[PDB]
Design a protein around this ligand. Structure first.
Ligand SMILES: Cc1ncc(COP(=O)(O)O)c(C=O)c1O
Ligand SMILES: Cc1ncc(COP(=O)(O)O)c(CN)c1O
Lengths: 494, 497
């Protein structure tokens, strides 16, 4: 009924095309005596009866409540189970989690992830699958190895995640920046970059985007924009790699008027159907061809130290990723898979939505606190633009450098020089937010792209990224007060 | 005091030289700072991490019933690791709290775990330069991947054993790294032959950046490089300026030599177990212990010691050499899974360095039994002409059956005098008998330089000898013995011997 994915192997790197798996890869087969692979006896693995406490859906006191008493699910995973009847929650037994094998991920884990995938997204082609990773850092590294030769070109957001950019730069992959605004990638500008792409220059292989709660701008690509960008990717034949660690940091609408906000907060909470309907569309759900690779992580949902995530893409696309994983990480840590699977399986798909609803709630409160402080403590004028993010853990403080009294004299109309001195001046006041320039994508092709493709809107706008994820409301508010005080003083505003 | 490592940065790959870490990395150190409010990270609240009170059972030193005994009754330690500790005194065991294991940070590995590893390092090795350190990895598979990224551009050359680990070779091949084979025998790498390869290295050809070696329980040959040979090999490395990467996942699978006479063995196995001092004295010297310059990189793994799915190992090397590996890790794999580090640290710390030696002695005992069983069966079921050679391994989990393909009746005719042809025949015939072994050619290193090396450097010692690698680690004594009966019989039948 659904079409098969397209074959994009013509985009595979030289390393991918050269990679041949070790022929040294039946152990469970009753009739074969296994004298081949060095699989050590599970009798020697020095752990049994792994137990833990996890909070209990629907997390009535908030997802941050102490884990005990009635807010507590308790369980134990054994090394071996006598019969399938002794394993009702379908845990990954330690004997299997701790033995070589299952480089794509343990099947119980991937089954939970596939079921979750079907709830969250609407898949438009037949042969999609998932592959477990050690997180989105790992997934992006693998994506570069799989597709990009030194000197290949990718498209990136004009400001993007510092590590992803650094990773591509180390490999000599050209990161060509495309324009973004308050609603993320601007499709018309993207289209123009492609239509005017200099003949002779390497064709971009893929677009690397963080569509929801963009790092660092905090923006989200509007649904209609994702549709227009997907069409551009089809017309110019590039893949879309969506890095989505913040997808579930989508928030309830920012409401500036406090009385209006209290009324809205007084209303019943979202049910599961309302939650799902409120979520942003995804490039995965738009993909009819298998040209989208989505990178998901448990870092911001469960914990950064889980070191576990997954990729979703076509069965065709996932082949070289699995071959690479087999020769690099091998498989995500068995214990992390056991504990993530066990907790998620007990929550169930529905209990996991309750968890994600709790996560949404906590972030909303943090965001409101941040934005309230900015409206209260920053100078209020066209020079200081505040965009309340609708998703993510980041906000930006935007500054028109050209309004500084010494921009022309002291700073030689150089916005970067002003940014750098404000950074120090802010740290001297006792708050650290991070310079926009650290996230600025830079790339050039041979032969070069035309002038129009290099344009920057508002070249005198500088910004700082802050986050509301990590600190108390009191510390957040005080930090932003200090920052705002610095800006008044520094800008000669009364 | 001790000398400082040498700077080998001239060996770093182009990718390594181009990798620049973010100024953002600096900032992530200003979290707990109380004078600067830090709104510059992306560290989610530990309040939301959905686990607390991680508990498990582990076996108990000195493991008197064997390291494979059930984890229960007396052979059982129980512990519980909390997410947070009210104060350090509510944490007497010095566990990595979950709130820290599961947060971003410590990309080199959690301090408690690295401290245990450093203490262990000092017990096992005799270190001879000042700035050695350790870095946690996701295992030797990833450590080798990382080594190739750090040092080798496409077209660079490394030296490898004539027969080596199939996966290491395939990793190098995928990256276009030339793997130039050097000769080995019953005692591992032959230093005189290695020295000649370097002496005769063709001017203008890429000079080797490193030797990749599996010195103890070599995969696949099962050999151990003699103490004096390591000393010689290290000198060659100093002379021709290459690094030594010792891939050592089988180091603690060393065994007493195989005693052929059963009476001679019963009385020797009658003597009480090694104490820790005789255990340590019995261990092979390491390239790490020879290193006075930081030219050695050791790759260690908990895979064969604790379990493969731990996905945890470490690299030992100079602070200078570890710097680009950490920079690469921060952009790739990041730190090993927090839960793996918590559970490995928690179990090892409670065993202590001494209980961990008891464990490793228990591992030696189990593999010794397995080796004896295998080698005994080979002497019972294999033909005993000069055309069938068994070298009983002193280390590791593999044995080989070396066979002169030439002595086969239908060799000239059915296989047109082609050893590889015979090897693939035998291999499928054996699997058809219900026993899985591995053809030796899957391990054969191949590489060439431009301009080519001279012919002396390319010589092979009678290409009519084929081999099969078997393992005694994975199955029961009874299955191992049956497996090797079928194999020895197949050989008897096939050679009409
Ligand atoms: C855009 C982006 N991708 C990935 C990550 C890290 O993901 P993970 O912890 O799963 O490796 C971060 C942080 C990020 O901002
Ligand atoms: C020489 C060698 N290196 C590495 C490994 C595996 O290392 P790890 O399981 O630590 O990734 C093996 C066996 N799988 C090996 O024999």
């Amino acid at each position: 009924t659904l079409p098969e994915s397209k074959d994009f192997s013509y985009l595979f790197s030289d390393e991918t095309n050269a990679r041949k798996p070790s022929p040294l890869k039946l152990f469970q087969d009753p009739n074969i005596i296994f004298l081949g692979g060095g699989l050590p006896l599970k009798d020697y693995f020095p752990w049994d009866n792994l137990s833990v406490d996890s909070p209990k859906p629907p997390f009535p006191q908030g997802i941050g409540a102490p884990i005990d008493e009635q807010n507590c699910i308790k369980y134990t995973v054994n090394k071996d189970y006598a019969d399938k009847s002794a394993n009702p929650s379908n845990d990954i037994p330690l004997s299997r989690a701790l033995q070589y094998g299952f480089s794509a991920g343990q099947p119980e884990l991937l089954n939970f992830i596939r079921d979750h995938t079907k709830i969250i997204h609407d898949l438009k082609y037949k042969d999609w699958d998932v592959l477990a990773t050690a997180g989105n850092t790992n997934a992006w590294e693998s994506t570069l190895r799989v597709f990009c030769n030194r000197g290949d070109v990718i498209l990136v957001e004009a400001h993007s995640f510092s590590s992803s950019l650094a990773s591509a730069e180390a490999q000599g992959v050209i990161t060509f920046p495309v324009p973004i605004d308050a609603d993320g990638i601007i499709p018309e500008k993207l289209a123009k970059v492609m239509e005017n792409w200099t003949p002779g220059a390497p064709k971009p292989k893929l677009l690397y985007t963080i569509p929801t709660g963009q790092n660092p701008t905090g923006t989200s690509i509007a649904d209609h924009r994702k549709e227009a960008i997907y069409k551009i990717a089809q017309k110019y034949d590039f893949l879309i790699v969506e890095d989505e660690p913040y997808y579930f940091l989508q928030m309830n609408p920012y409401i500036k008027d406090l009385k209006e906000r209290e009324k809205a907060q007084s209303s019943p909470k979202q049910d599961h159907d309302e939650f799902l309907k409120s979520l942003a569309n995804t490039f995965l759900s738009l993909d009819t061809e298998g040209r989208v690779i989505r990178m998901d992580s448990f870092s911001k949902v469960l914990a950064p130290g889980t070191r576990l995530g997954w990729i979703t893409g076509s069965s065709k696309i996932l082949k070289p990723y699995l071959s690479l994983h087999e020769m690099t990480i091998q498989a995500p840590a068995g214990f992390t898979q056991v504990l993530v699977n066990a907790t998620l399986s007990r929550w169930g798909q529905k209990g996991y939505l309750d968890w994600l609803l709790g996560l949404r709630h906590e972030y909303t409160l943090k965001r409101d606190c941040a934005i309230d402080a900015l409206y209260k403590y920053l100078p209020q004028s066209d020079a200081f633009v505040i965009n309340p993010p609708i998703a993510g853990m980041f906000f930006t403080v935007n500054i028109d450098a050209s309004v500084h009294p010494e921009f022309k004299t002291k700073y030689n109309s150089d916005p970067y020089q002003l940014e750098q001195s404000l950074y120090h001046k802010v740290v001297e006041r006792g708050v650290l937010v991070v310079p926009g320039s650290w996230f600025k994508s830079e790339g050039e092709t041979e032969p070069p792209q035309p002038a129009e493709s290099k344009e920057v809107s508002n070249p005198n706008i500088i910004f700082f990224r802050g986050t509301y994820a990590a600190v108390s409301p009191e510390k957040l508010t005080e930090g932003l007060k200090r920052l705002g005080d610095t800006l008044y003083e520094e800008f000669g505003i009364s």
